[PDB]
Amino acid sequence: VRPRSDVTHKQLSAFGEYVAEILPKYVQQVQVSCLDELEICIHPDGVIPTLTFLRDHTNAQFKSLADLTAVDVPTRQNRFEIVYNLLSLRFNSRIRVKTYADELTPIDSIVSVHIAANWYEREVWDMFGVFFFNHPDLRRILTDYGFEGHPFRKDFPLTGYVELRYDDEVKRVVAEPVELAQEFRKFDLNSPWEAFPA
C-alpha cells in the first residue's frame, strides 16, 4: 500500500474548487485523482486563459510546463486529449490541465504562456496531427523529412508503410512499401476474467 498523505488529497482538492470558481468558464470535471494529483479539465477555448491564470496568479504560481502530450482515444469523438502537466516551484505542487481536440479542430498554442511548449507542440503535430494556431514555427520535430502520416495515432501501423534500403541501380537510398520478414507477432493478452473492482 502506497503511503498516501490525506493532507495532500484535501489541499489539492480545495485548489481544484478554487480554480473552478475562479474560471467557471472553460473548466469542467475538476477532479483529484486517488494519486494525490489534480487534473482540471478545460474546454479547448480555455487553453490560453486557464494556463495564464496558473502561470501568473499569486495563490497558484505554475511557472514551468513539465509536458504537453496527446493521448488518442479513437472512440472519443474528439480523438486527441491534449494533456499539459505544470509544476509550482513555490508551492511544491503539480497540476494537469487536459483539453480535447479532434483531428481538424486546432487548439490554441501556449508558446506565449510558456515557451517550453514551442517544441512539444511541434512534437504533438508531428505524431498526432493536432494543429496549434499562432505557433511560431510548426514543423516536424521527430519524423523523417518526407514522412507521410502521423505516427503515434492509434490508427497508424507500427511498422508503418515505408522502409528504406540502398539501391545500386539508382545509387541512392529508396523507400519501398514495407515488407517485413517476421511480422510482429500480435499476442492477445487480455484475460477473459476481470478483477472485482476493490
Binding site: 540502398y166 539501391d167 545500386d168 541501380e169 512499401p177 520478414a181
Partner: protein
C-alpha cells in the same frame, strides 16, 4: 523442381529463380544481380575477385538470397559445384583486354563452353549466354570474331540456350560513354574518319539487365538470339561531342589513320595494368553498328529502351569540371540522330 512464387514483389519475397551468374562482378553483372535480387530470386554469384571487391553486391540481395562461391575458370570442378543447385545459368564472362594467362579465345569461348556443358550435366532449365553485337567469324576484331565462334559452340554443349547479343552498353561505369569522356586528359580526341561512318546505337545498361532478367522468367525465349540495341542510333561524331558537351569540355575531333591508331591501342595494350585502350577495342569502336536483323530484344522481351540523352547526365556528371556540374541536360543541346 521449382519454387512457387509467393510475396508482393519486393525484397523479402520469393520468385523461384535460383541462378548461377559467373561474371556478376561486372558492370553489366552488377545490374543483373540488382534486378534478380529485387525480384527475390535465389542468386549464386561465383567469384574469383577478392571478398572486399564482392561486398558491393551483398546489400541489394535480401538475407539468404545471395550466395557467393569461390571459382577458377581453369578448374572445371569449381563450375561443377556452382551449378549443382541452380536451375538458371547466366554467362557474362568477357574481358576486352587479353590478359597474360587468359587469352581472348579462352575467356570468350573456352570458359563458356565448359560452363554450358556443366549445367546440361546439372540439368539447369535454361542457360543465357551473352556475346557482343555484330559478331562474325570473319569480322574485324578478334574479340568479336571469337565471341562469334563461341555462340556456336555453346549451342552444341547446351541446345536451345538463349543468346542475347547486346550492343556496346550505355551506363554509369560503362566504357562506351566514359571512355570518350575521359579523352579529356588527351588534349586532342582522335576519331578515325573524324568520327564518321561508324554509326552506333547505345543501349542503357538497365534495359539490358531487365531484358536479361525477363528472359530468365519467360518461356518464349529458347534458342532465341535477341539483340538489345537502343532507342536511337548515332554517328560517332555527335556522340563524342555530345559527351564532351555534357562534360562541358572542349572538343577537337582529329582525324588519325586507324592504321596508325591500331598502333596506339597496341601501346596502351602493352601496359600491364588494365590497358585503357585495346587494339581490339579500337577496331570495335570504329566497327559500325549492325542494323537490327536478329531477334528483337528490348520491347520484345518487355522493356522499352531508354534514350541516351535521358540518363547521360548521370553517367557523365563526374567527368564534368568544378563548375557546370549543376548544368542539367535540357538547357544543354541534345545531338542529332543519324539512322543511316
Amino acid at each position: 523442381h521449382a519454387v512457387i512464387p509467393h510475396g508482393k514483389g519486393g525484397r523479402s519475397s520469393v520468385s523461384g529463380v535460383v541462378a548461377t551468374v559467373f561474371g556478376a562482378t561486372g558492370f553489366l553483372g552488377r545490374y543483373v544481380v540488382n534486378h534478380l535480387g529485387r525480384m527475390g530470386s535465389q542468386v549464386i554469384i561465383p567469384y574469383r575477385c577478392d571478398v572486399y571487391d564482392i561486398m558491393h553486391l551483398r546489400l541489394m540481395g535480401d538475407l539468404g538470397q545471395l550466395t557467393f562461391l569461390e571459382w577458377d575458370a581453369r578448374d572445371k570442378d569449381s563450375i561443377r559445384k556452382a551449378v549443382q543447385h541452380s536451375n538458371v545459368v547466366i554467362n557474362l564472362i568477357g574481358r576486352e583486354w587479353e590478359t597474360r594467362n587468359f587469352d581472348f579465345e579462352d575467356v570468350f569461348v573456352n570458359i563458356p563452353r565448359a560452363i554450358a556443358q556443366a549445367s546440361k550435366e546439372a540439368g539447369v532449365e535454361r542457360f543465357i549466354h551473352v556475346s557482343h553485337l555484330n559478331a562474325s567469324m570473319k569480322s574485324s576484331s578478334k574479340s568479336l570474331r571469337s565471341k562469334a565462334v563461341g555462340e556456336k559452340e555453346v549451342r552444341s554443349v547446351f541446345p536451345e540456350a538463349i543468346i542475347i547479343r547486346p550492343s556496346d552498353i550505355f551506363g554509369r561505369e560503362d566504357r562506351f560513354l566514359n571512355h570518350f569522356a575521359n579523352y579529356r586528359w588527351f588534349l586532342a580526341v582522335p576519331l578515325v574518319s573524324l568520327g564518321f561512318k561508324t554509326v552506333k546505337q547505345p543501349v542503357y545498361v538497365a534495359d539490358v539487365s531487365k531484358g536479361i532478367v525477363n528472359a530468365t522468367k519467360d518461356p518464349d525465349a529458347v534458342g532465341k538470339t535477341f539483340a538489345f540495341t537502343g532507342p536511337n542510333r548515332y554517328l560517332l561524331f555527335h556522340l563524342v561531342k555530345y559527351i564532351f558537351g555534357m562534360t562541358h569540355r572542349t572538343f577537337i575531333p582529329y582525324p588519325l589513320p586507324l592504321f596508325v591508331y591500331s598502333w596506339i591501342g597496341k601501346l596502351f595494350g602493352l601496359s600491364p595494368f588494365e590497358p585503357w585502350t585495346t587494339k581490339d577495342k579500337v577496331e570495335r569502336i570504329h566497327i559500325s553498328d549492325v542494323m537490327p536483323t536478329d531477334l528483337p530484344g528490348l520491347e520484345d522481351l518487355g522493356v522499352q529502351p531508354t534514350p541516351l540523352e535521358l540518363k547521360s547526365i548521370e553517367v557523365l556528371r563526374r567527368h564534368r569540371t568544378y563548375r557546370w556540374l549543376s548544368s542539367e541536360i535540357e538547357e544543354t543541346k541534345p545531338a542529332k540522330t543519324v539512322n543511316y
